[PDB]
Amino acid sequence: RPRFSFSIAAREGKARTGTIEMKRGVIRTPAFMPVGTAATVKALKPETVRATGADIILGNTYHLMLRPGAERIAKLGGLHSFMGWDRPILTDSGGYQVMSLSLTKQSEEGVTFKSHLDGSRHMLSPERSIEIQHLLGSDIVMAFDESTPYPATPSRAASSMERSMRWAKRSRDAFDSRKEQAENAALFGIQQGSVFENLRQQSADALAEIGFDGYAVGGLAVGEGQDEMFRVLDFSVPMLPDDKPHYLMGVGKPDDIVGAVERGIDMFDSVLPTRSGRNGQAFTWDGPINIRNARFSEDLKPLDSECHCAVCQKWSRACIHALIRAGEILGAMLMTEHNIAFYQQLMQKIRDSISEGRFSQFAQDFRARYFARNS
Amino acid sequence: RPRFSFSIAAREGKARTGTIEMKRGVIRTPAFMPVGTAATVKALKPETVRATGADIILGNTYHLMLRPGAERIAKLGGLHSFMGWDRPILTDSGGYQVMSLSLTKQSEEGVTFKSHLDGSRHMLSPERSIEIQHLLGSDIVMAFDESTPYPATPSRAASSMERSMRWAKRSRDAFDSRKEQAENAALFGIQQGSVFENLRQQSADALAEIGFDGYAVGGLAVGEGQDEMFRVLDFSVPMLPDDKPHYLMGVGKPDDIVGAVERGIDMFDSVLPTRSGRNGQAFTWDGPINIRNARFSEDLKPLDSECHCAVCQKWSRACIHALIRAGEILGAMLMTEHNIAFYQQLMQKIRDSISEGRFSQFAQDFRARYFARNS
Numbered sequence A, B: 001r002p003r004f005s006f007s008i009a010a011r012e013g014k015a016r017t018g019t020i021e022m023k024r025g026v027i028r029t030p031a032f033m034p035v036g037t038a039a040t041v042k043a044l045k046p047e048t049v050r051a052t053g054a055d056i057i058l059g060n061t062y063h064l065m066l067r068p069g070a071e072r073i074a075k076l077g078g079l080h081s082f083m084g085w086d087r088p089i090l091t092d093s094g095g096y097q098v099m100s101l102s103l104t105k106q107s108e109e110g111v112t113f114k115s116h117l118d119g120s121r122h123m124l125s126p127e128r129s130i131e132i133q134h135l136l137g138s139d140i141v142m143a144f145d146e147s148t149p150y151p152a153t154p155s156r157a158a159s160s161m162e163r164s165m166r167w168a169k170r171s172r173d174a175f176d177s178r179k180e181q182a183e184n185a186a187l188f189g190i191q192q193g194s195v196f197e198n199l200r201q202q203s204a205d206a207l208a209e210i211g212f213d214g215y216a217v218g219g220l221a222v223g224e225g226q227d228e229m230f231r232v233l234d235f236s237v238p239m240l241p242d243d244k245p246h247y248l249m250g251v252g253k254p255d256d257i258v259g260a261v262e263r264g265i266d267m268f269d270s271v272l273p274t275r276s277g278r279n280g281q282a283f284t285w286d287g288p289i290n291i292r293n294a295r296f297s298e299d300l301k302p303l304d305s306e307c308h309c310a311v312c313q314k315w316s317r318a319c320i321h322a323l324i325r326a327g328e329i330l331g332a333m334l335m336t337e338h339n340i341a342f343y344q345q346l347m348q349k350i351r352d353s354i355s356e357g358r359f360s361q362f363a364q365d366f367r368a369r370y371f372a373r374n375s
């Protein structure tokens, strides 16, 4: 198996379906990456997450730095041991949570911040981020960038973008300086530029000049609304190299995913299926449902009557309703498993429909049913 | 509150209803005692057992001797701390499980036996049994007797009975020798004599001459069938003192209980509700049901449609079916809670119907419905 090989098997308009081959396994694209945590009794088992169809999971570098720390994870054998997951793992850079969760100092050098847990001091930079992602042992490494809060002025958007591109070169060089990392992992760069077309083009040109294994679209899913997100994708994705994966970070709802694949995105991550499952919300082909609703108390149908997941083969809405209303952790576990599996089945229908040249029809059929809400 | 005061509030034929007042609480009679264990995550919580209506629980001295030992329980504060149960506790003597589970030596002195767990040596006798029950701190203490295996010859029945009566006097004197025990606990004697009327009368006369706070009918529920058990109760219970409680050890099924109250029994214990709940069997007014049966998979009714228990207010047969079939421990916990509560509701209907002078009608109505099995 190679370090990183992206092959496009079929196209329909801007949509693509194919595979990323890595040493730890094959990733089918378009791909949804669930957000991983430590393998403990409070989370789904990794064998359960794999059985839902996930080919790769995501780790948050910022949270792993704060607890238990990347040095400790490295001593435990790396993130694959820590998470009980032997297939590919993508790590984000840590920078987005720095802006939104932590911040002592900020400059072109990097950032110093305090842990929201215990007040300890931590530092991130292109060089430090790549080194920490090396300690975590991840397979896909994200360049460290600077996020611009939403909404952003044209000036703050241009300056964060230009800093992100200098930091993207520094991330590239840091990654290349460690043979063990450069020969075994892959590195993605992140396009910035907010809603501004010339800034997005500037960013894409800089990233393609540096050269990366894949290209992420950053700066979206931060409050802008789906219509504006789609308009930005309309011109932004064609600016990225066609023969490399396109990754939309932090997206999103099922209809966000469908519309983004229509616009050339190959990879997605979101906490939404897990967060919804813990809050008693299930995704279905007829839209999301709130299982606590009284109308489900005697509903013998599964959460979704077409879903193939292990939960829907066995459990009725009525019984999941009973568990959730009682506060039984089993209820949240079943809804979370179903939601992650539903997302993987959405990706599979997307892949199959592109392969057969009927994805445009699938997207229209999907929206008509998802928004009618005849659950 | 007194040490031990039995008051009969109402009678119907041989049936009685009333109260036993003890220092740790009031016991409503006829009473069902669930069999207790240590308060851990593997068992129902003691607050759950109390909420089902139980006024008193039973501890098995033999099992407590083997693990963790009565000395350890005493150091932990006694059985009330160990079991998380601050109301009355009855302990059996240990002797029945010696015959049926353990046996190095046996004589008029007592018995020596080996633990089926670790092979260690233990000793029981009237004096040792009463002392161990003192270490356990129980409120109702059972005299130590000799069980005769079923079926028993007239000779083996007479010799075990006569030994049990000499041991009953020794139990009385041992109990009286410890002021802390004699002033705060109560002591029951056990009638033996197998199916033989003259031996039962001999036994009763000996026990009444010694004098006890209550009188148990031993030697039944060991394979004899309900008809023979009832015939023995017919002549055996009237031999015991009328103004003291009558305790039928190890009984039993709901119809056993009803028929025994018709024959003058005031107290019962059985592992049946707990064993059934762990094996997916629920007691109902229409007879027991096997919840794994396919006919319950979409049955939205509770386990029993008249049962007041917390489980039946919330959970359907369908959902308990789902839990049991999945092997989820919650399923066994819910069925066990329901079964113990059903037993307490049976005792309450028995008490109310005796009070109102309609118990004979209740028993006939109960049998007609319980054995029709229109569940």
Ligand SMILES: O=S1(=O)C[C@H](O)[C@@H](O)C1
Residues within 6 Å of the ligand: A034, A035, A036, A037, A038, A039, A040, A043, A044, A045, A046, A047, A049, A050, A057, A083, A084, A085
């Ligand atoms: O996403 S997982 O497979 C489930 C749990 O969070 C970890 O074992 C990683």
Ligand SMILES: O=S1(=O)C[C@H](O)[C@@H](O)C1
Residues within 6 Å of the ligand: A064, A065, A066, A068, A069, A070, A071, A072, A121, A122, A123, A132
């Ligand atoms: O991830 S760590 O172990 C925690 C801290 O930021 C450094 O020690 C690196």
Ligand SMILES: O=S1(=O)C[C@H](O)[C@@H](O)C1
Residues within 6 Å of the ligand: B034, B035, B036, B037, B038, B039, B040, B043, B044, B045, B046, B047, B049, B050, B057, B083, B084, B085
């Ligand atoms: O019967 S109990 O109340 C439940 C458990 O066995 C112990 O706490 C005693």
Ligand SMILES: O=S1(=O)C[C@H](O)[C@@H](O)C1
Residues within 6 Å of the ligand: B064, B065, B066, B068, B069, B070, B071, B072, B121, B122, B123, B132
């Ligand atoms: O119950 S015990 O502690 C165990 C053994 O039978 C003696 O030590 C009395």
Ligand SMILES: [Zn+2]
Residues within 6 Å of the ligand: A303, A304, A307, A308, A309, A310, A311, A312, A338, A339, A341, A342
């Ligand atoms: Zn499902």
Ligand SMILES: [Zn+2]
Residues within 6 Å of the ligand: B303, B304, B307, B308, B309, B310, B311, B312, B338, B339, B341, B342
């Ligand atoms: Zn019930």
